[PDB]
Scaffold this motif. Structure first.
Motif, PDB file in Angstrom:
ATOM      1  N   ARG A  63       0.823  -1.157   0.000  1.00 46.82           N
ATOM      2  CA  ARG A  63       0.000   0.000   0.000  1.00 46.82           C
ATOM      3  C   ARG A  63       0.867   1.219   0.000  1.00 46.82           C
ATOM      4  NH1 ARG A  63      -3.663  -1.277  -2.566  1.00 46.82           N
ATOM      5  NH2 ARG A  63      -4.664   0.699  -2.188  1.00 46.82           N
ATOM      6  N   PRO A  64       0.287   2.327  -0.391  1.00 48.08           N
ATOM      7  CA  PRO A  64       0.976   3.596  -0.437  1.00 48.08           C
ATOM      8  C   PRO A  64       1.404   3.976   0.942  1.00 48.08           C
ATOM      9  CG  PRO A  64      -0.835   3.708  -1.807  1.00 48.08           C
ATOM     10  CD  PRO A  64      -0.926   2.382  -1.193  1.00 48.08           C
ATOM     11  N   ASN A  65       0.656   3.525   1.924  1.00 47.01           N
ATOM     12  CA  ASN A  65       0.933   3.839   3.293  1.00 47.01           C
ATOM     13  C   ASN A  65       1.848   2.839   3.935  1.00 47.01           C
ATOM     14  OD1 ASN A  65      -0.764   1.790   4.034  1.00 47.01           O
ATOM     15  ND2 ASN A  65      -2.248   3.068   4.994  1.00 47.01           N
ATOM     16  N   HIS A  66       2.420   1.981   3.121  1.00 47.54           N
ATOM     17  CA  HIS A  66       3.425   1.042   3.549  1.00 47.54           C
ATOM     18  C   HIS A  66       2.969  -0.129   4.371  1.00 47.54           C
ATOM     19  CE1 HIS A  66       6.026   4.133   2.034  1.00 47.54           C
ATOM     20  NE2 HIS A  66       5.524   4.981   2.899  1.00 47.54           N
ATOM     21  N   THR A  67       1.738  -0.537   4.197  1.00 52.03           N
ATOM     22  CA  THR A  67       1.191  -1.653   4.901  1.00 52.03           C
ATOM     23  C   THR A  67       0.667  -2.559   3.834  1.00 52.03           C
ATOM     24  OG1 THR A  67      -1.131  -1.032   5.097  1.00 52.03           O
ATOM     25  CG2 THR A  67       0.372  -0.028   6.552  1.00 52.03           C
ATOM     26  N   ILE A  68       0.371  -3.792   4.171  1.00 61.99           N
ATOM     27  CA  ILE A  68      -0.229  -4.687   3.217  1.00 61.99           C
ATOM     28  C   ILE A  68      -1.447  -5.277   3.839  1.00 61.99           C
ATOM     29  CG2 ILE A  68       1.895  -5.214   2.164  1.00 61.99           C
ATOM     30  CD1 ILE A  68       1.826  -7.754   3.741  1.00 61.99           C
ATOM     31  N   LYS A  69      -2.421  -5.634   3.028  1.00 62.87           N
ATOM     32  CA  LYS A  69      -3.621  -6.238   3.542  1.00 62.87           C
ATOM     33  C   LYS A  69      -3.517  -7.714   3.347  1.00 62.87           C
ATOM     34  CE  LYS A  69      -6.471  -2.323   2.644  1.00 62.87           C
ATOM     35  NZ  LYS A  69      -7.258  -1.675   1.570  1.00 62.87           N
ATOM     36  N   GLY A  70      -3.074  -8.391   4.383  1.00 66.06           N
ATOM     37  CA  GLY A  70      -2.719  -9.782   4.339  1.00 66.06           C
ATOM     38  C   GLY A  70      -3.571 -10.585   5.273  1.00 66.06           C
ATOM     39  N   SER A  71      -3.353 -11.875   5.315  1.00 70.70           N
ATOM     40  CA  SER A  71      -3.994 -12.684   6.295  1.00 70.70           C
ATOM     41  C   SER A  71      -2.896 -13.264   7.122  1.00 70.70           C
ATOM     42  CB  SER A  71      -4.753 -13.778   5.598  1.00 70.70           C
ATOM     43  OG  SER A  71      -5.408 -14.609   6.508  1.00 70.70           O
ATOM     44  N   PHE A  72      -2.757 -12.802   8.343  1.00 69.76           N
ATOM     45  CA  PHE A  72      -1.693 -13.271   9.192  1.00 69.76           C
ATOM     46  C   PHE A  72      -2.210 -13.562  10.575  1.00 69.76           C
ATOM     47  CE2 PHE A  72       1.244 -10.899   6.391  1.00 69.76           C
ATOM     48  CZ  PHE A  72       1.953 -11.963   6.008  1.00 69.76           C
ATOM     49  N   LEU A  73      -1.651 -14.579  11.191  1.00 69.66           N
ATOM     50  CA  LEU A  73      -2.035 -14.975  12.515  1.00 69.66           C
ATOM     51  C   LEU A  73      -0.792 -15.085  13.306  1.00 69.66           C
ATOM     52  CD1 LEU A  73      -4.394 -17.833  11.627  1.00 69.66           C
ATOM     53  CD2 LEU A  73      -5.098 -15.709  12.462  1.00 69.66           C
ATOM     54  N   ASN A  74      -0.924 -15.123  14.608  1.00 67.61           N
ATOM     55  CA  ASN A  74       0.252 -15.167  15.415  1.00 67.61           C
ATOM     56  C   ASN A  74       1.061 -16.399  15.139  1.00 67.61           C
ATOM     57  OD1 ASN A  74       2.189 -14.989  17.230  1.00 67.61           O
ATOM     58  ND2 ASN A  74       0.895 -14.913  19.003  1.00 67.61           N
ATOM     59  N   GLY A  75       2.362 -16.234  15.119  1.00 69.50           N
ATOM     60  CA  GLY A  75       3.265 -17.258  14.675  1.00 69.50           C
ATOM     61  C   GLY A  75       3.598 -17.175  13.213  1.00 69.50           C
ATOM     62  N   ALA A 117       2.699  -5.058   8.827  1.00 64.35           N
ATOM     63  CA  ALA A 117       3.939  -4.340   8.657  1.00 64.35           C
ATOM     64  C   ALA A 117       5.112  -5.246   8.895  1.00 64.35           C
ATOM     65  CB  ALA A 117       3.987  -3.193   9.589  1.00 64.35           C
ATOM     66  N   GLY A 118       6.188  -5.018   8.170  1.00 59.67           N
ATOM     67  CA  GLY A 118       7.315  -5.901   8.124  1.00 59.67           C
ATOM     68  C   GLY A 118       8.420  -5.143   7.474  1.00 59.67           C
ATOM     69  N   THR A 119       9.455  -5.837   7.051  1.00 56.22           N
ATOM     70  CA  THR A 119      10.675  -5.223   6.579  1.00 56.22           C
ATOM     71  C   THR A 119      11.123  -5.840   5.300  1.00 56.22           C
ATOM     72  OG1 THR A 119      12.314  -6.749   7.452  1.00 56.22           O
ATOM     73  CG2 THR A 119      11.437  -5.167   8.912  1.00 56.22           C
ATOM     74  N   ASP A 120      12.088  -5.217   4.671  1.00 58.17           N
ATOM     75  CA  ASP A 120      12.726  -5.835   3.553  1.00 58.17           C
ATOM     76  C   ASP A 120      13.688  -6.791   4.165  1.00 58.17           C
ATOM     77  OD1 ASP A 120      15.192  -4.651   4.218  1.00 58.17           O
ATOM     78  OD2 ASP A 120      14.735  -2.950   2.992  1.00 58.17           O
ATOM     79  N   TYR A 166       9.309  -1.250   6.160  1.00 56.13           N
ATOM     80  CA  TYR A 166       8.515  -0.516   5.224  1.00 56.13           C
ATOM     81  C   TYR A 166       7.664   0.340   6.088  1.00 56.13           C
ATOM     82  CZ  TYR A 166       9.845  -3.707   1.596  1.00 56.13           C
ATOM     83  OH  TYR A 166      10.540  -4.438   0.698  1.00 56.13           O
ATOM     84  N   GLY A 167       7.628   1.627   5.765  1.00 55.76           N
ATOM     85  CA  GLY A 167       6.947   2.601   6.587  1.00 55.76           C
ATOM     86  C   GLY A 167       7.910   3.001   7.687  1.00 55.76           C
TER      87      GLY A 167
END
Lengths: 300, 5
Positions: A131-143, A173-176, A182-183
């Motif tokens: 996203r432009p705002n540096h986030t992604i719309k994903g499906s993530f759960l803990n772990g 949010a995460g990193t390269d 990112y962000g």
């Protein structure tokens, strides 16, 4: 024929997913050659997250401090370094199943595949746009931390994301792969919020081109709008501005359909102004901004 | 706040 939100084949990546345990925390790691990469916050706890200092935390640990298991096989950590928000653990064994790869920093509006993995084991593959705002719309759960995003160029794998955390909105949010976020987000469990997002215009247009490519042309018209005239509308609707560079990028698609970029910009303005009145584009209720021009081409 | 995964 047909247009679907696809993903890159994930085998090459699957071969490089491993589990990393530290303390009472288990998350995924990426094992390329003799290196295994994972989020630095693995060393954190139910309390450190609250306000940590990574350097302190790091030296109270050692190679024995981390258990790395590949498949059912333990792996020998001999080195640990820290690169930004990531951890690098060296291991005795260079992965046999290591493919040609490189690390890239994805730019906003570009897309990538995500291989969601729990406990070092891959659970699913899906397609995601930065996203432009540096986030992604994903499906993530803990772990799911340590799961990565990637693109493939023929044989080569470019890694562009590793998963760290979830924002209050449910976006991620995460990193390269050099640990740079990112962000502006930081790896602290403290209030952080996604910036107000905006729509990726270049992508919506490419999408429209795909639709035309795919036979629904209902939204076309004989009109044309100027580059500045359109942008005024875009601004109104929270769309990103179109630029000449972006127009150039669309040229092949325009050519293939024989549909000028500005005309399509006209069609869009109208759609923006009038909606769809319960019509479908590519079986879609609303304009879709998650396919790049490049994606559209690789699929048509 | 942010939730780690």
């Amino acid at each position: 024929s047909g247009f679907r939100k696809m993903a890159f084949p994930s085998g090459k990546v699957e071969g490089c997913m491993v589990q990393v345990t530290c303390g009472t925390t288990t998350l995924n790691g990426l094992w390329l050659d003799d290196t295994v990469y994972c989020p630095r916050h693995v060393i954190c706890t139910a309390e450190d997250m609250l306000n940590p200092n990574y350097e302190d935390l790091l030296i109270r640990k050692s190679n024995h401090s981390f258990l790395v298991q590949a498949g059912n096989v333990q792996l020998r950590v001999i080195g640990h370094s820290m690169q930004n928000c990531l951890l690098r653990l060296k291991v005795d064994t260079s992965n046999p199943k290591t493919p040609k790869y490189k690390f890239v920093r994805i730019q906003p509006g570009q897309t990538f595949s995500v291989l969601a993995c729990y406990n070092g084991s891959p659970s699913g593959v899906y397609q995601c746009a930065m996203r432009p705002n540096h986030t992604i719309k994903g499906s993530f759960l803990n772990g799911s931390c340590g799961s990565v995003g990637f693109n493939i160029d023929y044989d080569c794998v470019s890694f562009c994301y590793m998963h760290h955390m979830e924002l209050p909105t449910g976006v991620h949010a995460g990193t390269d792969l050099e640990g740079k976020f990112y962000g502006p987000f930081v790896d602290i469990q403290t209030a952080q919020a996604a910036g107000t997002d905006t729509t990726i215009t270049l992508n919506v247009l490419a999408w429209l081109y795909a639709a035309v490519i795919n036979g629904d042309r209902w939204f076309l018209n004989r009109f044309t709008t100027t580059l500045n005239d359109f942008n005024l509308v875009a601004m109104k609707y929270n769309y990103e501005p179109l630029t000449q560079d972006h127009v150039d990028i669309l040229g092949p698609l325009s050519a293939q359909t024989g549909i000028a970029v500005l005309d399509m910009c006209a069609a869009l303005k109208e759609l923006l102004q009038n909606g769809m009145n319960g019509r479908t584009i590519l079986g879609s209720t609303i304009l879709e901004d998650e396919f790049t021009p490049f994606d559209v081409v690789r699929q048509c | 706040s942010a939730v780690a995964h």
